[PDB]
Structure 1
Amino acid sequence: ATFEIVNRCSYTVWAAASKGDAALDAGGRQLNSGESWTINVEPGTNGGKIWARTDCYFDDSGSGICKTGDCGGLLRCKRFGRPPTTLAEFSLNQYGKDYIDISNIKGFNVPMNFSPTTRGCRGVRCAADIVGQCPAKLKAPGGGCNDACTVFQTSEYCCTTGKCGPTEYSRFFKRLCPDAFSYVLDKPTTVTCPGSSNYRVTFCPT
């Protein structure tokens, strides 16, 4: 499957793509404002994620640090990124269909559109100014808007027991971005696409 990753932000981002225990494609790359990077994701990938990282520094070996979304200090991510991270999430070729969503469960750093480039389903978007409107207690000093689990480490926010409800903090993310997951047991905003669809992830779509 092809994913075209487009940075429409005025600032540089370092895109990342992983399924948690491996890179997808090269796993990460710098995208200056306006740049596009097309990756190939193996059919059947379950639990893949694409995200932006901000304010990164990498040495010549590809080792360094990012203020949001850092994946063990690597340019080329093999693992998931440090919150806060707006997440484009997908599982491909799952009994004939693909499943996509955007999630704010690990917070928000950069606005995103995640859309098919092929027929048969709709995209999803979370492009509100979540960072600017972020509740004071969720603001990440390093940049971005943390989720409440990350900040407070409670069963209720992290849904540890598999029982949790919406919270004042989840409702903030849901108000600004109704079409993204705001907490683990949110009413799903997953889109079912034809199996083997292709996609585009656009940072700062508006």
Structure 2
Amino acid sequence: ATFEIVNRCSYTVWAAASKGDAALDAGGRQLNSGESWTINVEPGTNGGKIWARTDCYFDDSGSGICKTGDCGGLLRCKRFGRPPTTLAEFSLNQYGKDYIDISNIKGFNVPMNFSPTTRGCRGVRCAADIVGQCPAKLKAPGGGCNDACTVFQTSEYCCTTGKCGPTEYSRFFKRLCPDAFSYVLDKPTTVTCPGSSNYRVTFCPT
């Protein structure tokens, strides 16, 4: 499957793509404002994610740091990134279908649209100014808006027991972005696409 990753933000981002225990494609690449990077993701990829990272410094060997979404200091991500990270999430060729969503469960850093480029389903978007409107207690000094699990490490916010409810903090993410996951047990906003669809992830779509 092809994922065209497009940075419409006015600032550089470093895209990342991983399934948690491996890179997807090269795993990461710089995208200056307006650039596009097309990656190939293997059919059957389960639990893949794409995200932006902000304010990165890398050395000649690809080693460094980002203020958001850092994936163990690597340009080329093999693992998931440090919150806060707005997440484009996908499982492909899962009994004949693909499943896509956007999640704010690991916070928000960059607005995003995640849409198919092929027929048969709708995209999803979380483009509201979550960083600017972020509750004081969630603001990440490093940049972005942290999820409450990250900040507070409670069973209730992290849904550790599998019994959690919505919270003041989850309701903020949900209010600004109703079509993204706000906490682990949120009513799903997952979209079912045809198996082997192709996609475009756009940062700062509006």
Question: Per the shorter chain, which TM-score range?
Answer: over 0.9
Alpha-carbon distance, 1:53 to partner: 0.1
* CA distance in structure 2 between the aligned counterparts of 1:64 and 1:98, rounded to whole angstroms: 34
How far residue 34 of structure 1 moved from its aligned partner, in angstroms, is 0.2
* Counterparts of 2:111 and 2:10, CA distance in 1: 12
- In the alignment, the residues of structure 2 paired with residue 62 and residue 126 of structure 1 have an alpha-carbon distance, to the nearest angstrom, of 30
Give 1:96 deviation, angstroms.
Answer: 0.1
Deviation at 1:121, TM superposition (A): 0.0
* Partners of 1:132 and 1:198 in 2: CA distance: 32
What per-residue deviation string (whole Å, max 9, x for no partner) do you get for residues 30-67 of structure 1?
A: 00000000000000000000000000000000000000
1:135, distance to aligned residue in structure 2 (A): 0.1
CA shift at 1:130, angstroms?
0.1
- Deviation of 1:83 after TM superposition, in Å, equals 0.0
1:170 is displaced (CA, Å) by 0.1
User: Which ranges of structure 1 fall in alignment gaps of 5 or more residues?
Assistant: none
Shift in Å, 1:184: 0.1
Which residues of structure 2 form unaligned runs of 5+?
none
Inter-partner Cα distance in structure 2 for 1:38 and 1:32: 14
Q: For the residues of structure 1 that align with 2:96 and 2:7, how far apart are their CA atoms?
A: 30
Q: CA RMSD in A?
A: 0.1
Distance 2:86 2:143 in 1: 12
- 1:89 Cα offset (Å): 0.1
Question: Per-residue displacement from partner, 1:78-122 (whole Å, max 9, x unpaired)?
Answer: 000000000000000000000000000000000000000000000
Deviation at 1:12, TM superposition (A): 0.0
Give the deviation of 1:77 after TM superposition: 0.1
Kindly, what percent of the aligned residue pairs are identical? 100
Deviations 1:143-180 (A, max 9, x none): 00000000000000000000000000000000000000
| Separation (CA, whole Å) in 1 of partners of 2:34 and 2:167 | 37
Q: Residues of 2 paired with 1:153 and 1:195: CA distance? A: 37
**Structure 2 Cα separation of the partners of residues 177 and 83 of structure 1:** 18
Instruction: Give the distance between the partners of 2:165 and 2:105, measured in 1 at CA.
Output: 13
- The residue that corresponds to 1:95 in the other structure is 95
